[PDB]
Amino acid sequence: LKRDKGLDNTLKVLKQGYLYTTNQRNRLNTSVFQTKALGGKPFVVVTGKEGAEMFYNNDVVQREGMLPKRIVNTLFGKGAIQTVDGKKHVDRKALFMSLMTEGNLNYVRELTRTLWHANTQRMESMDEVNIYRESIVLLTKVGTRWAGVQAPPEDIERIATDMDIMIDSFRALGGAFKGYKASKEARRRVEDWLEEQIIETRKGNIHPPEGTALYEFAHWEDYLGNPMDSRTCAIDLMNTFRPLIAINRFVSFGLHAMNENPITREKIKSEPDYAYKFAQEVRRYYPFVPFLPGKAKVDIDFQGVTIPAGVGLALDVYGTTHDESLWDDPNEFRPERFETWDGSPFDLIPQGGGDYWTNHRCAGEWITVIIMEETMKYFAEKITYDVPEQDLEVDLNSIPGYVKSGFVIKNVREVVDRT
Numbered sequence: 149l150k151r152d153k154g155l156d157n158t159l160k161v162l163k164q165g166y167l168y169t170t171n172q173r174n175r176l177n178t179s180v181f182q183t184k185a186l187g188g189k190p191f192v193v194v195t196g197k198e199g200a201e202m203f204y205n206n207d208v209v210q211r212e213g214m215l216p217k218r219i220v221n222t223l224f225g226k227g228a229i230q231t232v233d234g235k236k237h238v239d240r241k242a243l244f245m246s247l248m249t250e251g252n253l254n255y256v257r258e259l260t261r262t263l264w265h266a267n268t269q270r271m272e273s274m275d276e277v278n279i280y281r282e283s284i285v286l287l288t289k290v291g292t293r294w295a296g297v298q299a300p301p302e303d304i305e306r307i308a309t310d311m312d313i314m315i316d317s318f319r320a321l322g323g324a325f326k327g328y329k330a331s332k333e334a335r336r337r338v339e340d341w342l343e344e345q346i347i348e349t350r351k352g353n354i355h356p357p358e359g360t361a362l363y364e365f366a367h368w369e370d371y372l373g374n375p376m377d378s379r380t381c382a383i384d385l386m387n388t389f390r391p392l393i394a395i396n397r398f399v400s401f402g403l404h405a406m407n408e409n410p411i412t413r414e415k416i417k418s419e420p421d422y423a424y425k426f427a428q429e430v431r432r433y434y435p436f437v438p439f440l441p442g443k444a445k446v447d448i449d450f451q452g453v454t455i456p457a458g459v460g461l462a463l464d465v466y467g468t469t470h471d472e473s474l475w476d477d478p479n480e481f482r483p484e485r486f487e488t489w490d491g492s493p494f495d496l497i498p499q500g501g502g503d504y505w506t507n508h509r510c511a512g513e514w515i516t517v518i519i520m521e522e523t524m525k526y527f528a529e530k531i532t533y534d535v536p537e538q539d540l541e542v543d544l545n546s547i548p549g550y551v552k553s554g555f556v557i558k559n560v561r562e563v564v565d566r567t
């Protein structure tokens with residue numbers, strides 16, 4: 149088992165970012181390697197379809213307790229679905245999956261569409277529009293409503309900012325950092341607000357619609373016959389829409405892709421099924437999740453080495469989505485590649501891999517793709533706009549992935565045939 153040197157390589161991982169793991173595989177000439185991080189903890193980095201298949205074998209890999217605690221404290225919440233494994237996890241995961249009906253998915257589609265259409269005037273009136281910011285505010289509107297949570301309009305900008313702080317809080321991979329305290333306080337504010345809504349729902353003082361997250365989470369009973377305690381219930385209720393709001397990252401990246409590859413715009417407009425392919429390709433190509441932590445429960449034989457019991461595991465998300473053998477030209481943006489993708493659970497893993505129901509794989513992938521379809525269709529078809537000189541760099545050596553400027557547009561004008 150080959151190794152990246154030192155006693156602790158955390159600073160080096162942060163310096164190389166999304167390119168760390170691939171830099172190490174190239175220079176060490178291997179598909180699998182160990183490194184130490186987060187204070188001398190050994191992690192074996194696995195990649196590709198075989199890496200993802202093993203990482204999602206529950207007989208042999210633990211996820212519980214493996215997330216850095218500071219990231220639990222800011223991004224997910226204590227006792228969240230991401231923190232639990234086994235029967236308890238499967239049971240609670242089914243509640244999340246139960247929201248993803250045909251009707252509820254068709255509703256998030258309609259909400260996204262209506263709100264972009266309703267936002268056109270505002271964007272015309274602005275001197276410039278930072279798409280990262282504008283989209284995070286619009287998606288807070290979409291997400292709170294889809295989840296059955298009432299958010300007064302005066303509070304939407306605050307809530308969006310709080311979510312943004314939480315979403316960004318994996319940047320130090322669990323280390324201390326300047327905004328850590330502010331990040332916890334943002335989370336507290338959002339948990340308190342949601343707990344109040346769960347309490348008032350259970351008390352019968354408010355009446356969210358049946359099939360909404362707030363309704364279904366407030367009333368659900370676990371497999372032993374118990375509802376969640378109200379704080380846990382608020383924490384997991386946030387997990388139904390904070391990551392929806394995080395789609396703003398992908399909205400910024402999608403406008404970037406359309407600007408860099410103007411042929412895509414035309415095809416999103418003219419071509420059936422293309423908005424779907426474009427959305428998939430934003431998720432594959434652009435950086436968001438670098439890797440995911442786990443632990444070997446037992447010795448594991450893998451690609452010619454033995455991973456000892458008790459050692460950490462890191463599934464390389466960026467590496468897999470950018471694997472030369474899986475995608476032919478992994479560093480080119482080419483939506484047509486999805487004409488031949490066979491739907492594997494183990495290659496297109498930007499929001500995880502494996503099985504939705506028994507693994508920690510994202511419950512929100514359909515929603516992500518639907519929002520990205522409708523949002524890219526809007527920007528491609530419904531408005532024209534200019535793109536000013538600005539800093540469009542996406543620095544692959546810096547976690548998290550952002551367009552430096554946020555992606556700014558100007559001179560927004562609705563497309564209307566008035567003849």
Ligand code: HEM
Pocket residue numbers: 229230231241244387388389391392393394395396398436437440498499500501507508509510511512513515516
């Ligand atoms: C915006 C981009 C999104 C990204 C990058 C993202 C990424 C991910 C990742 C990496 C995981 C963990 C996979 C694992 O641990 O094996 C995950 C889990 C999760 N995602 Fe997402 N996701 C996004 C959007 C959404 C949306 C829109 C929702 C809900 C509407 C959602 C709900 C969740 C839930 C509930 C889990 C936990 C499932 C579990 O622990 O079993 N995600 N997501």
Ligand SMILES: CC/C=C/C/C=C/C/C=C/C/C=C/C/C=C/CCCC(=O)O
Pocket residue numbers: 161183185186191193215216219223314315318321390391392394437438439440441462
């Ligand atoms: C080379 C490695 C050492 C690995 C160390 C382990 C680091 C843990 C990294 C966890 C990063 C998880 C980021 C996931 C972000 C989910 C999308 C955001 C949506 C949401 O708000 O939940």
